[PDB]
Amino acid sequence: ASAPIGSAIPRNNWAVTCDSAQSGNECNKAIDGNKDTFWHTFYGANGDPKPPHTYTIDMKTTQNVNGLSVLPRQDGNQNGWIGRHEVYLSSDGTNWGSPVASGSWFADSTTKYSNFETRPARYVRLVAITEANGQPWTSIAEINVFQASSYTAPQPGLGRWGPTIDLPIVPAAAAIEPTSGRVLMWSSYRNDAFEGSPGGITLTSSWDPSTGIVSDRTVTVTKHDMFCPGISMDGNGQIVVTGGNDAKKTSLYDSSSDSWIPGPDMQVARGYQSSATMSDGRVFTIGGSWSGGVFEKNGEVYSPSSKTWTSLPNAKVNPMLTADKQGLYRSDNHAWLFGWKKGSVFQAGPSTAMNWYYTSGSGDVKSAGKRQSNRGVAPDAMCGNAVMYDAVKGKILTFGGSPDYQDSDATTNAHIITLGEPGTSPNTVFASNGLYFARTFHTSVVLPDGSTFITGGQRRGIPFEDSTPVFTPEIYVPEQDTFYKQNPNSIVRAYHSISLLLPDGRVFNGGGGLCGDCTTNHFDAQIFTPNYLYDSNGNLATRPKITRTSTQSVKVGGRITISTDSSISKASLIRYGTATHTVNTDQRRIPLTLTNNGGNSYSFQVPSDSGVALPGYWMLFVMNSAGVPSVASTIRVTQ
Ligand SMILES: [Ca+2]
Ligand SMILES: [Cu+2]
Known part of the structure; x- marks a missing residue:
């Protein structure tokens, strides 16, 4: 297998x-x-x-x-x-x-x-x-x-x-456990299969970057086969995993206790939906016709405080549907959702039409214009990626995908979307000259320096098959508006693959397959170590150290003072990530404006708007003049 x-x-x-x-x-x-x-x-x-x-x-x-x-x-x-x-x-x-x-x-x-x-x-x-x-x-x-x-x-x-990390499962879904630094992964009721599930069971595995240890666990306490879910880290610091093989279930992963806790059922049964954490720490979701039925699945919202899901039927899914040939089964999948100001959620794609979603009352939706550029209107980009690499400036980089989920040619299309206030149509332009390699089912993470690492996928989307693979990753560098090919890998990472940023600044990329008795299961992951961790001779560079922080938990608008062992030029906050099916609505980056106190003491303010500084766990990185990042210090941001 x-x-x-x-x-x-x-x-x-x-x-x-x-x-x-x-x-x-x-x-x-x-x-x-x-x-x-x-x-x-x-x-x-x-x-x-x-x-x-x-x-x-x-x-x-x-x-x-x-x-x-x-x-x-x-x-x-x-x-x-x-x-x-x-x-x-x-x-x-x-x-x-x-x-x-x-x-x-x-x-x-x-x-x-x-x-x-x-x-x-x-x-x-x-x-x-x-x-x-x-x-x-x-x-x-x-x-x-x-x-x-x-x-x-x-x-x-x-x-x-x-190296390669060998695993006992195919890691088609994953998250960083921010309090421990471990990578959490899961498949379905079986290690490599979702088909024929009796429900109520998820196999999980974890990898500890500090010890190299791979562990595993069978999770039944939440009565949830969590294959094909929505995933969001809520403001209470718990990962909300919704639907999928058990389409109405909600499971909560608590990093602090390393345990799974039952949540309330969703109002609507869903699979392959995206969910997004909001400015108030709640979680919004919409769409998801892979499981639970094929019909219009409008918005709903989860409150960590009251432990409830409430339907938002007037947050209508219709305006975000792609024109997928297969119809609703596909067309409401994997929205490019971002929590934003005043309880809003921006939907950047994959549909050509972009939309604002509102969560007051019974919900609302407003057109935000079409994703486009002077090259024309962007086509539907199912399983393209979207990454908020500068939340302070509202910057979202989008790229790749194909007009239909399956049997469809991927593209090199890429855009920069610049968000302003909810209810305004954002500026969109083309990103550079687009990707080097057309790809769908690829994955991506924003790096400490604001660049976006893009890896895997295939040129023509064929789930469970490792054909037309793309082995060369790319990095987008915003300051240069340029893409750069990186060194290639040897393992296809297409449908059911994931990537996450590690606290140590490397990228964890894994999975692919999960089709039972198929030949394309990848029971593994690999580390990508970016060039910013190497010196000119190809040896690992000396990294600056954060030797003290004034606090590790801060309210939006609050200041943090830090000491370092060496002078630093730049700093950023990167929200911890979650990943499945190309979707990661949890990561985002805030570039920090530093005050230099002298003597390698610095301070910064966390943005006062929690639609930008979305509550949850964040990584603080500092970078020296050579561009070498520290390892992350974990900061909890609250509101
Ligand atoms: Ca033998
Ligand atoms: Cu799937």
């Missing part, structure tokens, strides 16, 4: 070694081409030495390695499955450096994969750190290593991909 990115390397001249092997289950039984023979570590009379266990391959010559695979025993024995693991490569066989991949594999007998950026190597080492259910042994029926067609060294200055 997955696949390698390369082609299997012939093994008939390989030499292998293992930390131990039972007689009859020798090390080389894992490479003899026989599914019924297997390597197994010591047991019985030779004792039961516990993991870590290690399998090392000498391929004799250099190969352009981009993955490996492990076929478990196929005789019903479950006690040697590899859980936590690391993959190492070497050119000399003695020094191995950092893992090219690490994480945790699901506990079953299916073939497991580690896919990673191509690297020339002669030696490959798999370390089984744990057995999947905590038993002493490791076994492998067949291990294979895969090679790419070629190898191209990354270009200096264009960032770096790696």
Whole structure:
């Protein structure tokens, strides 16, 4: 239920070694081409030495390695499955450096994969750190290593991909847990399938950037299969996850307690809706005909205080529908929603028509004009992305997508929308000359410096298929009104992929697939490390440190004073992100106007308008003159 990115390397001249092997289950039984023979570590009379266990391959010559695979025993024995693991490569066989991949594999007998950026190597080492259910042994029926067609060294200055994080699920939805710094991920009732769900179950997984540990959990307490949901971080600091496979349910993720809490049912059953946090910390949602029925699903609003959903039937979905050939099932999906001033929500697309949504009384909607430029009126851009990279100036960058959800050519179209007051038609212009690569199902994040990182997708949208993939990410730099290609990766990230900004300033990009017995499930993620973390020699740059903050919780309009260990030139606040199905209505950036107190002490004001400084958790980044950001300090913004 997955696949390698390369082609299997012939093994008939390989030499292998293992930390131990039972007689009859020798090390080389894992490479003899026989599914019924297997390597197994010591047991019985030779004792039961516990993991870590290690399998090392000498391929004799250099190969352009981009993955490996492990076929478990196929005789019903479950006690040697590899859980936590690391993959190492070497050119000399003695020094191995950092893992090219690490994480945790699901506990079953299916073939497991580690896919990673191509690297020339002669030696490959798999370390089984744990057995999947905590038993002493490791076994492998067949291990294979895969090679790419070629190898191209990354270009200096264009960032770096790696390592791979191996996961027990396909992470088609994800969020940062702001109080812990971990990445939260979920699939559906199964690790790679949503089809045939009985409801009431979500498999989740987390990755801790500080320890590298991948964990997992089965969530049933909210009686919610959270595949295909709306996602918003509300003003009470809880992630509101709505609908999807259980179309009327609301689940609340609480970062502080790392737990899921039941919420009230929505008034209208929805799937593939967007939701957006508002200036008052409430959550607005509209549309979503993927589940719960296909009909006009107007707005509704969630109050964290009263724990209620209230219908806003006059916040009409009709003005935001695309012209999708498939009709309403698609046309109300994945709105480009942004909470804004005075309880309003701006809808930037994907429909050509942009709209203001209002949340007083029973709701309202007002035309905000068409997304357009001197190049003409922008077509519908389903699963294009929208990123508010300067909330203070109302700036939204939009890009990509296709006129129909499926079987439709994506475009390079890109715009800058500049928001003013609710009820006014914003200025829209074309962004630079558009994307380098037409793409849909791509994902994106705003970076500390205000640039937008754009990655993945495919040129023609075909859910569950990894055709016409785009492997080269792009960064939009607003000050230059220019896009820049970055170094490419090796793993397709199209439908059901996610990206999030990490507190350490790197990008977490993963997922794709989630179609059960399909070959396109990606049980993994990769890190992109932007160029701003590297010095001129390609080594990791020294980062400025925030050595003190006057407070970590601030009201809108409030000031914060900070100390740094070195002089800084710029600072920004970036709201923590959530992601699924190309939608991320939680991220946004505020560039900060600094007062220099001298002696590397600075102060700034959080914007007084909570439609700009949307309540929730934010990352504070400072940047030195060289453009190197600190790691984030977490700030809670309230109103
Ligand atoms: Ca075998
Ligand atoms: Cu989906």
